[PDB]
Ligand binder design. Structure first.
Ligand SMILES: Nc1ncnc2c1ncn2[C@@H]1O[C@H](COP(=O)(O)O)[C@@H](O)[C@H]1O
Ligand SMILES: Nc1ncnc2c1ncn2[C@@H]1O[C@H](COP(=O)(O)O)[C@@H](O)[C@H]1O
Ligand SMILES: CC(C)(CO)[C@@H](O)C(=O)NCCC(=O)O
Ligand SMILES: CC(C)(CO)[C@@H](O)C(=O)NCCC(=O)O
Lengths: 283, 283
């Protein structure tokens, strides 16, 4: 049996009871409208005794120029998918449970978040860090499962966890893709037929770049140009950024040594999509 | 037997073991050089199965114009006092355990901290919130015991705890005073003979103000003037602020209704002392 919980007080009691039986807790934070990407995280979380999925379209991490109002929402779909995939609790708080009238506290940081999407989305990572601090305090998980698809987010959260001494682990999981390469995302629902066809250039640029890197290419300027050439063939695509950075610091790399995070963000029509590849432990 | 612990890893293990035996934990955060004020907090904490005292002169909450370098330090004194008063663990981390090389995260808020001492001490409450978030995550206490002497701090921390869903309680304890009324403080060690004599005007102004309030005086402008008159008789005293505020919001009060926090900060020579009184539940 799976519990669908909307109350903070109630979620805390359930977690407290699990702890009293020394049960481990795996946690998958999401914004709902679930897909196979989220399910791959749940599957990893099943290594723990109990699995929690949160579904919360967090208003703090959206700006007015973004898509808070149109963000896909379908709780019936999500609940069914969690039920069918062995989730123990679905935590679906509404914003009035999470952010009371006098709420004014926040968590933020002075490194990492100023690069990539963080530079393009003022206030976004403050929203992410703040809401996850709350969820982590409420749910007291042992391992938190997050997708490599939001690479910078993984690094930001890992850093917050280290800096603030959260007694938990962040486990990063691989990007799950559609049959034709497109990284799975709830935002893919926005794409028209023509836009979806164009969006494939994003994953194609990622596939090429990773192939070049693994074949010994160290010049990031050259890799980026090769990626740009693919993307520029699609008139529906407006590049937001293409960057090859150090995976630990998010700082730009001119010449690759031990690691590289190659990240792309682009608008396909109005929809902002992201994708990346990550290579570590190069000689 | 009492454990003196300097390692974060070691403190976490001790706390984890206590939790496995379902023991409650009382926590008293301090900056060391202990006195009877701190001991009164320990006494309250003894309602819990285990008591932890932390001693850490937190560099984040001092500005360069303040007294980080001269802050009284005597670990031998502190350890003995904890030992003699039934403390189970004294946690004395050094700054390199707390703030690693790449540390950049912080906790702060957009209300409450901009008033009183917060307005006079830029960055102070960010330092307080950030370090207590870390201690709370490390030590996992059930109740945290703090002194009314730092009234604004109590309100700030309580708010952070509510906003970020920390599963613990903040218990506020009464101001402990020297025989002649001076609020106990490690900073009292700075005072010369003449300065200590002058400093008594601070507690005297507090005693008078509370008496006036409890006798039905509602005009804060009048109470503040009566306090000013006492303080202005001491040439060694330079007033930083005298404010009567709502205890929940820290906003100034012109006319008293249900509550009042009357707070004073003043320099006696170079030393910055604070004191207050708190009245609640007035008809
Ligand atoms: N295609 C994907 N593959 C792997 N993880 C993903 C994918 N899409 C989203 N996630 C992860 O799922 C979690 C919730 O995503 P979101 O629902 O978009 O807030 C985050 O950890 C994401 O990185
Ligand atoms: N005279 C006092 N009476 C009661 N509590 C105090 C007193 N002085 C300090 N405290 C509290 O002891 C804790 C540590 O104070 P400090 O050591 O100055 O950082 C804080 O909760 C203070 O409010
Ligand atoms: C981890 C959560 C679910 C926390 O709200 C969220 O930060 C997230 O995964 N969103 C990533 C995609 C985005 O917000 O643009
Ligand atoms: C609660 C602690 C010990 C946390 O460092 C500290 O914020 C504190 O009590 N100091 C109050 C006096 C001051 O820092 O000026």
């Amino acid at each position: 049996a799976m519990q669908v919980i909307t109350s903070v007080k109630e979620a805390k009691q359930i977690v407290k009871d699990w702890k009293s039986h020394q049960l481990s807790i795996g946690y998958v934070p999401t914004m709902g409208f679930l897909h196979d990407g989220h399910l791959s995280l749940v599957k990893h979380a099943k290594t723990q005794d109990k699995v929690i999925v949160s579904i919360f379209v967090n208003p703090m991490q959206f700006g007015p120029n973004e898509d808070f109002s149109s963000y896909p929402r379908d709780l019936e779909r999500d609940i069914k998918m969690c039920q069918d995939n062995g989730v123990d609790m679905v935590f679906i708080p509404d914003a009035t449970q999470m952010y009371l009238k006098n709420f004014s506290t926040y968590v933020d940081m002075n490194t990492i978040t100023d690069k990539l999407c963080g530079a393009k989305r003022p206030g976004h990572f403050r929203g992410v860090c703040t809401v996850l601090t709350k969820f982590f305090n409420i749910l007291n998980p042992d391992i938190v499962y997050m997708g490599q698809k939001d690479a910078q987010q993984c690094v930001v959260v890992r850093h917050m966890v280290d800096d603030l001494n959260f007694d938990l682990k962040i486990q990063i999981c691989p990007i799950i893709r559609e049959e034709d390469g497109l990284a799975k995302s709830s935002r893919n629902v926005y794409l028209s037929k023509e836009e979806r066809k164009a969006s494939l250039a994003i994953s194609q640029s990622i596939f090429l770049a990773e192939k070049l890197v693994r074949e010994g290419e160290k010049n990031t300027s050259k890799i980026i140009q090769a990626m740009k050439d693919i993307l520029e063939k699609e008139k529906l695509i407006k590049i937001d950024y293409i960057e090859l950075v150090d995976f630990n610091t998010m700082e730009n790399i001119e010449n690759i040594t031990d690691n590289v995070l190659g990240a792309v963000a682009a608008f396909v029509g109005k929809t902002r999509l992201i994708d990346n590849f990550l290579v570590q432990g190069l000689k």
